């Protein structure tokens, strides 16, 4: 048995070694069979693929270099790959291979067949407080880990939380994650999840991730987010107004935790104070949570997705399938040299 201080110290030594000497060019597109698109958007696409050499399935994130440049995501993309190849935690999807070709950048991660929390939460409607707390404890531990390595995650939401066959969470999508000791200023995130200090264009720090945890716990427990509207500008007005309403079925403990996470005043927001994450972990809402048992995956999960077989994609929606075009000329060579 070791302390958390001691676990994190060793975790930092492990991380820094990979951070300072990143892995590069560890596979080639030709080793993979394409099966199905799992997600798309202007920010890239993710495809289910099979590795011929092992028969393993993977989730391959594909980014078009020229579109990354037009979206001003060059440095964010180098961040994502550099950080992901360096981290190691039970609730983070693992990066298995990365490489690039003339046209695209590729990150090959482990495939999580249970799907996004997003789809289960929306169908079922809402999670019970014990169910929500099980998931929230995993994010609390993950943020403890990431934050200790000077990493900010900046995109927590149900869309980015996959449910594995044991019913535990895997965080995916590190496209806005960043290693920063001071403050930082980029406008990024998702509207419903943005802290007031992002909206107000202040320099901000890892406290934005703790605010986003409050939004997530609310959304999981209520079935809808604490600030919603038809357009983002209207969401921002609600977020900065300083007001929140809880459902009557929320426990007293839950409301009190959420008041301290959805706290506009940075000198008062849980996560950010002298006692750090322990203000959260020692809160009464988490009194039943055995943090080691969660880290060890020894707790029985409240929900187990349906298996159906290796490669089955039923727990994911259908997307339009698009070619993987590889130009015969190298694009953006300088910009992505370190990838």
């Amino acid at each position: 048995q070791e302390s958390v201080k001691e676990f994190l110290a060793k975790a930092k030594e492990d991380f820094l070694k990979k951070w300072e000497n990143p892995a590069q060019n560890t596979a080639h597109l030709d080793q993979f069979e394409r099966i199905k698109t799992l997600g798309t958007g202007s920010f890239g696409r993710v495809m289910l693929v099979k590795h011929m050499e092992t028969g393993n399935h993977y989730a391959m994130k594909i980014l078009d270099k020229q579109k990354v440049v037009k979206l001003k995501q060059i440095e964010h993309t180098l961040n994502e790959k550099r950080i992901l190849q360096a981290v190691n935690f039970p609730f983070l999807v693992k990066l298995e291979f990365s490489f690039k070709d003339n046209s695209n950048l590729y990150m090959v991660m482990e495939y999580v067949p249970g799907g996004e929390m997003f789809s289960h939460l929306r169908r079922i409607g809402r999670f019970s407080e014990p169910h929500a707390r099980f998931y929230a404890a995993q994010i609390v531990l993950t943020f403890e880990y990431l934050h200790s390595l000077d990493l900010i995650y900046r995109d927590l939401k149900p869309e980015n939380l996959l449910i594995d066959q044991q019913g535990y969470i895997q965080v995916t999508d590190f496209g806005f994650a960043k290693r920063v000791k001071g403050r930082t200023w980029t406008l990024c995130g998702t509207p419903e999840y943005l802290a007031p200090e992002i909206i107000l264009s202040k320099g901000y720090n890892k406290a934005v991730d703790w605010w986003a945890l409050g939004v997530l716990i609310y959304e999981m427990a209520a079935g809808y987010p604490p600030f919603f509207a038809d357009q983002p500008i209207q969401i921002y007005e609600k977020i900065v107004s300083g007001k929140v309403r809880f459902p009557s079925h929320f426990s007293s403990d839950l409301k009190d935790l959420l008041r301290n996470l959805l706290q506009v005043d940075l000198t008062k927001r849980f996560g950010n104070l002298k006692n750090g994450v322990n203000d959260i972990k020692n809160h009464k809402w988490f009194a039943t949570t055995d943090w080691i048992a969660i880290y060890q995956r020894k707790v029985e999960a409240p929900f187990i997705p349906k298996f159906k077989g290796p490669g089955d994609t039923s727990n994911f929606d259908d997307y339009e399938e698009e070619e993987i075009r590889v130009s015969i000329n190298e694009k953006c060579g300088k910009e992505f040299s370190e990838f």
Binding site: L71, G175, L187, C188, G189, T190, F228, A229, P232
Partner: peptide
């Protein structure tokens, strides 16, 4: 109800990230 207001809203599907 707040649920009905959310369900009638245009932001009940997967949400994209923002950027400037």
């Amino acid at each position: 109800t707040t649920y009905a207001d959310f369900i009638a809203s245009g932001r009940t599907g997967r949400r994209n990230a923002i950027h400037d």
